[PDB]
Amino acid sequence: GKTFFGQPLGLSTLFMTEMWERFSYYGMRAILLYYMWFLISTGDLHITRATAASIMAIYASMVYLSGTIGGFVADRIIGARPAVFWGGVLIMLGHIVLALPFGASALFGSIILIIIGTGFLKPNVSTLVGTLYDEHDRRRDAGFSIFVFGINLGAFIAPLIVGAAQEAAGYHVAFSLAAIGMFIGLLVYYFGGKKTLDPHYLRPTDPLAPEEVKPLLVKVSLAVAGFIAIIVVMNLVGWNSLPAYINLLTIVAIAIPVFYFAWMITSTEHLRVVSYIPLFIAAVLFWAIEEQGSVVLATFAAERVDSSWFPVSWFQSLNPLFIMLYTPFFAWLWTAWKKNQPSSPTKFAVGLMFAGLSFLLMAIPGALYGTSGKVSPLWLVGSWALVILGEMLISMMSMWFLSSSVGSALNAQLVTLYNAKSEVAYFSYFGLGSVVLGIVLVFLSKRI
Ligand SMILES: CCCCCCC/C=C\CCCCCC(=O)OC[C@@H](O)CO
Ligand SMILES: CCCCCCC/C=C\CCCCCC(=O)OC[C@@H](O)CO
Ligand SMILES: CCCCCCC/C=C\CCCCCC(=O)OC[C@@H](O)CO
Ligand SMILES: CCCCCCC/C=C\CCCCCC(=O)OC[C@@H](O)CO
Ligand SMILES: CCCCCCC/C=C\CCCCCC(=O)OC[C@@H](O)CO
Ligand SMILES: CCCCCCC/C=C\CCCCCC(=O)OC[C@@H](O)CO
Ligand SMILES: CCCCCCC/C=C\CCCCCC(=O)OC[C@@H](O)CO
Ligand SMILES: CCCCCCC/C=C\CCCCCC(=O)OC[C@@H](O)CO
Ligand SMILES: CCCCCCC/C=C\CCCCCC(=O)OC[C@@H](O)CO
Ligand SMILES: CCCCCCC/C=C\CCCCCC(=O)OC[C@@H](O)CO
Ligand SMILES: CCCCCCC/C=C\CCCCCC(=O)OC[C@@H](O)CO
Ligand SMILES: CCCCCCC/C=C\CCCCCC(=O)OC[C@@H](O)CO
Ligand SMILES: CCCCCCC/C=C\CCCCCC(=O)OC[C@@H](O)CO
Ligand SMILES: CCCCCCC/C=C\CCCCCC(=O)OC[C@@H](O)CO
Ligand SMILES: CCCCCCC/C=C\CCCCCC(=O)OC[C@@H](O)CO
Ligand SMILES: CCCCCCC/C=C\CCCCCC(=O)OC[C@@H](O)CO
Ligand SMILES: CCCCCCC/C=C\CCCCCC(=O)OC[C@@H](O)CO
Ligand SMILES: CCCCCCC/C=C\CCCCCC(=O)OC[C@@H](O)CO
Ligand SMILES: CCCCCCC/C=C\CCCCCC(=O)OC[C@@H](O)CO
Ligand SMILES: CCCCCCC/C=C\CCCCCC(=O)OC[C@@H](O)CO
Ligand SMILES: CCCCCCC/C=C\CCCCCC(=O)OC[C@@H](O)CO
Ligand SMILES: N[C@@H](Cc1ccccc1)C(=O)O
Numbered sequence: 001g002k003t004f005f006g007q008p009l010g011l012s013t014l015f016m017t018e019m020w021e022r023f024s025y026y027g028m029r030a031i032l033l034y035y036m037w038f039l040i041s042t043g044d045l046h047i048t049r050a051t052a053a054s055i056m057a058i059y060a061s062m063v064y065l066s067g068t069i070g071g072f073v074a075d076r077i078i079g080a081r082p083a084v085f086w087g088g089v090l091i092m093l094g095h096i097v098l099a100l101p102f103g104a105s106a107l108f109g110s111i112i113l114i115i116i117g118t119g120f121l122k123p124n125v126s127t128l129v130g131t132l133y134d135e136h137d138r139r140r141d142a143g144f145s146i147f148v149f150g151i152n153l154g155a156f157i158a159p160l161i162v163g164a165a166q167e168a169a170g171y172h173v174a175f176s177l178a179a180i181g182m183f184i185g186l187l188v189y190y191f192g193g194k195k196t197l198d199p200h201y202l203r204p205t206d207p208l209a210p211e212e213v214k215p216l217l218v219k220v221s222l223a224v225a226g227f228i229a230i231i232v233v234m235n236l237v238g239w240n241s242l243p244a245y246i247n248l249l250t251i252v253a254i255a256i257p258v259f260y261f262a263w264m265i266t267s268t269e270h271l272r273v274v275s276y277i278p279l280f281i282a283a284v285l286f287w288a289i290e291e292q293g294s295v296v297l298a299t300f301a302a303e304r305v306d307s308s309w310f311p312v313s314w315f316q317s318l319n320p321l322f323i324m325l326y327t328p329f330f331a332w333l334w335t336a337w338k339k340n341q342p343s344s345p346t347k348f349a350v351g352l353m354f355a356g357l358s359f360l361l362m363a364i365p366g367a368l369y370g371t372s373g374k375v376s377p378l379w380l381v382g383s384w385a386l387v388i389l390g391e392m393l394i395s396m397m398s399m400w401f402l403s404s405s406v407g408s409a410l411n412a413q414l415v416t417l418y419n420a421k422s423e424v425a426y427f428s429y430f431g432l433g434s435v436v437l438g439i440v441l442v443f444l445s446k447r448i
Contacts, residue, residue, distance in 0.1 A: 025118065088189065306376070322385055358387035359428075
């Protein structure tokens with residue numbers, strides 16, 4: 001009987017749905033930094049390029065922090081399938097905002113819409129993939145691997161299409177393509193879902209009991225009130241610049257796992273929770289480096305590379321391209337390698353060392369040739385080749401979204417240090433540091 005690569009046919013609907021959402025997200029991000037550079041260049045947007053880079057990082061951080069509660073809201077309040085649909089709608093609207101004939105004034109509205117939308121859609125589209133399978137089913141992990149391939153499929157073709165469109169017909173048109181991408185995702189999702197998805201997930205699977213409603217409301221109200229109080233105080237004391245607000249979001253993002261871990265810490269349980277701290281840190285630092293590809297490596301692509309024969313935003317395709325290219329091998333690897341299939345911590349250790357190697361490699365062209373000229377595109381190609389080796393090793397949903405969010409929050413401060421005069425030191429020191437405490441994670445690995 002017909003399947004989608006051996007899997008239930010529903011996977012095809014969810015495959016394409018996420019491929020097109022990821023298309024809209026990554027197509028937009030492959031030109032967003034350049035768009036801000038452009039807005040700065042015309043005097044419309046009053047920030048430094050450093051701050052612009054910082055915005056890209058905290059933006060990514062908020063997008064995944066939002067997903068850490070998206071699952072809850074679907075499971076307990078609105079249902080997984082409506083979460084994805086209305087999430088998709090909010091994302092489309094976010095891209096439409098940028099297609100409108102506005103400038104810097106439209107940036108915030110776009111960002112908020114996409115942050116909220118992605119929080120609803122991403123964890124729940126992934127959750128729905130699981131719903132295709134009985135828990136007894138063995139295909140389940142193959143199904144997600146296919147799903148992830150779809151994620152990177154969209155991530156791969158989006159910069160090629162949106163970037164080319166930007167150079168040809170301008171930014172607004174290019175952003176409109178992203179919106180259209182999400183629109184296409186919603187169409188397939190809506191009509192394909194009705195044919196192939198369980199109507200069980202039109203509603204929340206664990207709806208709030210009567211006595212649970214008021215305490216939840218109290219809880220979120222106190223969080224919103226406290227957050228609002230801090231912003232009030234910040235303006236009183238004069239800490240009300242954009243970087244001040246970015247610093248606030250950074251702190252909140254990092255305070256969450258810290259606050260979390262610190263007071264969940266019988267004696268044995270205590271330690272095994274403490275056992276996952278270094279692995280959480282490993283994921284955070286790895287995703288820090290991985291997410292810098294769209295910021296620092298994007299900057300390097302635009303400023304330090306001779307690629308005058310194609311849109312520089314196309315370098316953003318190398319990351320998911322390598323994912324797709326590496327997948328057949330690692331499929332072969334994990335089967336064929338049966339004994340000594342290594343510690344989940346070790347996969348984290350090595351994965352971080354590779355990330356560290358990817359940056360160390362980028363320290364070389366400036367050390368050898370200087371930083372005022374331009375170097376071969378192959379440095380970036382080699383750099384992404386290394387960091388994606390790590391990502392192959394690295395692959396609750398919330399925690400996963402959380403490690404990423406903290407990584408990008410860290411980036412929001414780090415990437416402000418990058419410039420052509422810091423380049424070599426920047427790459428070398430953050431590169432070495434990552435290798436070193438990926439090695440430190442080897443000393444500790446089995447001590448765990
Ligand atoms: C106009 C404002 C738009 C609001 C959209 C921005 C939302 C960004 C982040 C959502 C904050 C939720 C806090 C996350 C949280 O509670 O912790 C995650 C939970 O998994 C703890 O492990
Ligand atoms: C229609 C309103 C859209 C803007 C807000 C979207 C709703 C976002 C958050 C609602 C708060 C729900 C509480 C989140 C929460 O407590 O998460 C608990 C955490 O354990 C998640 O696993
Ligand atoms: C300026 C804001 C524009 C917003 C316009 C968006 C209107 C979109 C759809 C109109 C109603 C269709 C309802 C479809 C729906 O509820 O989907 C439910 C979802 O669970 C599908 O699986
Ligand atoms: C407890 C609630 C957490 C709130 C999370 C914060 C979500 C709100 C905004 C996030 C936007 C990130 C920064 C976007 C930005 O600075 O762009 C605006 C600027 O370009 C306009 O001049
Ligand atoms: C990069 C140019 C586009 C060509 C991509 C190949 C055809 C595109 C989509 C159909 C294949 C999607 C399923 C991918 C797949 O079979 O997964 C392989 C491996 O991860 C096992 O799950
Ligand atoms: C169905 C809703 C999602 C699809 C969005 C539909 C977008 C369709 C057309 C958007 C046109 C955007 C380009 C308009 C524009 O400002 O171009 C700038 C031009 O004047 C300079 O080259
Ligand atoms: C400049 C563009 C116009 C701005 C508003 C565009 C609104 C476009 C689309 C609204 C949501 C489309 C959702 C697609 C879908 O499958 O919905 C089906 C549902 O309505 C059937 O009841
Ligand atoms: C799109 C909806 C997101 C809701 C944002 C969260 C609002 C803040 C606190 C939760 C208040 C309870 C709202 C959920 C609710 O109405 O529960 C009713 C139902 O689950 C049981 O009666
Ligand atoms: C729903 C959660 C609380 C949001 C209600 C109060 C909203 C006020 C501020 C939201 C914090 C976002 C920080 C980004 C921001 O405000 O941009 C800074 C801009 O004014 C630069 O001057
Ligand atoms: C008021 C104390 C409540 C608990 C602490 C919560 C976080 C406290 C301060 C965070 C404010 C944002 C980061 C600090 C800040 O604004 O930097 C100032 C500087 O950027 C202005 O140029
Ligand atoms: C008693 C609580 C456990 C021990 C306290 C741990 C501290 C808790 C939260 C601190 C947030 C991390 C600091 C955020 C950060 O590194 O950003 C620095 C920068 O944004 C400040 O301008
Ligand atoms: C997997 C193999 C790829 C290895 C690539 C990384 C190679 C190892 C170290 C490269 C470090 C280059 C440091 C050059 C340097 O920092 O000196 C430059 C300085 O003197 C001028 O600013
Ligand atoms: C799986 C481990 C990855 C193995 C990677 C091995 C790569 C070995 C060395 C890479 C260092 C960069 C070489 C420096 C270089 O070629 O510069 C010379 C070049 O500019 C041509 O004149
Ligand atoms: C696994 C082998 C990969 C080779 C990595 C070795 C690369 C080490 C350093 C980068 C090449 C030297 C760059 C030129 C250099 O640093 O000379 C010092 C110069 O900057 C002082 O003016
Ligand atoms: C996105 C992948 C990057 C493609 C890797 C290609 C790297 C190899 C060579 C790049 C530059 C040399 C070939 C292009 C070139 O400069 O030809 C000369 C031309 O610019 C004269 O106008
Ligand atoms: C499966 C392979 C993954 C690991 C590969 C590591 C790649 C290491 C280095 C690649 C880039 C360094 C070589 C750059 C290069 O070709 O020199 C530039 C030369 O064209 C002068 O313009
Ligand atoms: C058949 C096994 C495949 C595994 C290949 C592993 C080889 C690791 C890295 C290959 C990258 C090539 C290193 C680039 C280099 O050495 O610089 C080239 C330089 O000579 C150009 O002038
Ligand atoms: C429990 C997991 C914790 C996650 C560990 C990651 C947080 C550790 C350190 C974050 C400190 C970042 C401070 C960077 C900084 O302030 O310097 C950049 C500054 O110059 C920006 O202008
Ligand atoms: C004993 C364990 C050591 C393992 C670390 C292996 C790391 C491999 C290569 C590291 C190359 C170091 C690069 C030198 C460096 O960063 O200094 C130059 C830098 O300051 C440029 O401004
Ligand atoms: C355990 C995670 C640690 C992550 C945070 C580490 C960052 C610490 C300090 C950053 C600011 C001062 C360090 C400056 C630096 O490392 O690079 C040199 C500078 O020229 C360019 O970055
Ligand atoms: C400048 C050249 C430095 C070369 C560094 C060589 C590789 C880096 C460190 C040696 C490997 C770790 C050595 C200690 C060790 O094996 O730890 C004990 C065991 O528990 C391993 O987990
Ligand atoms: N490249 C990953 C980034 C990511 C990791 C973890 C959570 C969310 C996003 C993706 O698009 O899925």
